[PDB]
Each structure stands twice: as structure tokens, then as C-alpha cells.
Subunit: 85 residues, 4 copies
Amino acid sequence: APADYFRILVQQFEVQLQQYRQQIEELENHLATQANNSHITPQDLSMAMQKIYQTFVALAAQLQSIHENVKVLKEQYLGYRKMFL
Amino acid sequence: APADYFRILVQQFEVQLQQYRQQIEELENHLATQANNSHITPQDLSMAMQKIYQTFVALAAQLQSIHENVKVLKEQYLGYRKMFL
Amino acid sequence: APADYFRILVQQFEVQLQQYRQQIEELENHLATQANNSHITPQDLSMAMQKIYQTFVALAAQLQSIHENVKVLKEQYLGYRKMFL
Amino acid sequence: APADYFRILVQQFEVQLQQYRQQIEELENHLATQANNSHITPQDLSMAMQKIYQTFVALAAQLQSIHENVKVLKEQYLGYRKMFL
């Protein structure tokens, strides 16, 4: 600590960004499937866009949590700097 | 004529989702290198999160445009469907 | 029927290429964490390289499998064209 | 230090693996493109496979170059080991 703490926060950011990326990839491939199995439809397009917004809301929650943690770290360092002047 | 338009709307959605995934892939690959040579800093994490939000706001604009186009196609679809029924 | 057979061969190719990507991407994600928070013995670099080669040999077996099927399809196409001329 | 050199070797591996993934992804999107346009053809499948083999041979060359460097590093450590006995 505290570099260990931040190292965990960074590991979390990366891993979350990967999961998200692969959720998007799953969509791209789901469409690539129903592009040569049966031309894509409006219904498909709408549920897809819907899955995009949804999965991003999830990602954003994750990023917000990470943001809170780093903000705490910043406030701690701050206090130290306020004492030292 | 309709199927063609929507075919182009589908092509747009896919290629937009591709570009998006590429930008995110760049971010990740940038953190995987800027963490190997030296150590990622809270500044990097912050700017990365920021670029994610910006990148999604862009993608979202693209998606809304596509959504308007399909909505129009739906308006016409109902234009006929209402007369014949 | 010929178009259908080939259609299946085509989505088999794409999907095999997808899974191949996932295997790689995964290998990279394992390095973007186990090497950015800690160090990594060269023999782990060797293990990764070895997983690359093995994963490719698998992919190549898949590709040759589908290649045989298109080759047969070509032989049939050829038989028809030859009788006709 | 030998850690700096090997650190560069690791950065090379990762970056070459990302590049590789990008070439495969590009080719993988190219098929998604020429699927919604017309229909993927045996010509396409053939050239695509050829692209896979060709791109992997390049990747393997890169990996071989890396392997020789780590090999040298190992022989060096070895020379030290034989002295210490």
C-alpha cells in the first residue's frame, strides 16, 4: 500500500474493459451469424442497440466505483499535503 | 427498395460497432504497454475513463441516427399496413 | 442446395476464426495483468509462444477441413461444367 | 540490466500479438462486409485462408526473432552458472 491498492484498482479497470469488449464482440458475432443464416431484421437491430446501452450502463457503474476509490486516495494524499503545506 | 436501405443501416451499425471496439482496443493496448515500460498513474486511469465516456457518447450519437432511420421505415411500414388493414 | 452447404462452410470458417481470436485475446489479457503488476520468467514467455503455435495448428486443422469440403464442391462444379462442354 | 532488455522483448511480443489480432479482425470484418453486400464466395474463402496462413508465417518469424533473444539471455545466465558451479 498504497501503490498496491491502486494496482488492484488498475487491474480492475483493465479486466472490466476486457469483459465489456468481449460482450460487444459477442454481439458483433451474433449479428455476423444472423447475417448469413437469415438477413438481419429491425427487431434484431433494436435489441442490439438496447444491449449496447445496457452493457455500457453496467460498465459505467463499474468505472464509477473505481473513480470513487481513486478519489479517496486523492483525498488522503491531499490531507498529507495540507499538513506538510 | 426498403430492404436495401435497411441493409445499409445494418452495415452502418456493424462498422460503427467495429470502429468503437477498435478505439477501446487501442485504450487497453495502450495501458498494457504504458504499464509494462513503467507504472500507470491515477492520471492515466482518469483520462482513460474520460476517453471511454467520450467514445461512447460518439457511438451513441451514431446509434441514435440509425434509430431515427429505422423509425422512419416503421412510420411508412405503418402507413401501408394501416390502409391494407 | 450447393449455396446452403457453402453457407454453412462459410459461417463455420468465420466462427472458427472468432474462437481463435478469443483464444489469442485471452492469452494477451493474461499477460496484460500477470506482467504489469509483477514480473514474468522468460519460460512463461516461452509457454505463451507455445500456446500460440498450438492454437494455430488447431485452427489450421479446422481450415484444412473446410478446404476439403470446398475442394469437393469444386470437383462437382467441374464435373457439370465438363459434361456441358 | 537484463531485466530492461527482457522487458523490451516482452513489449515486442505483446505488441506483435496485438498487431496479429488486428489483421485477423480486419479480415474477419471484411467477410461481415461482403456478406451483407452480396454473398461470400469460394473465391473469398480461399483468399481469406491464404491471408491467415501468410499472416501467421509473419507472426511466427517475429516470434522466432524474440525466441533467439531470450535464448541468448539464457546462455549468458548459463555462463555465469557454470562459473559459480
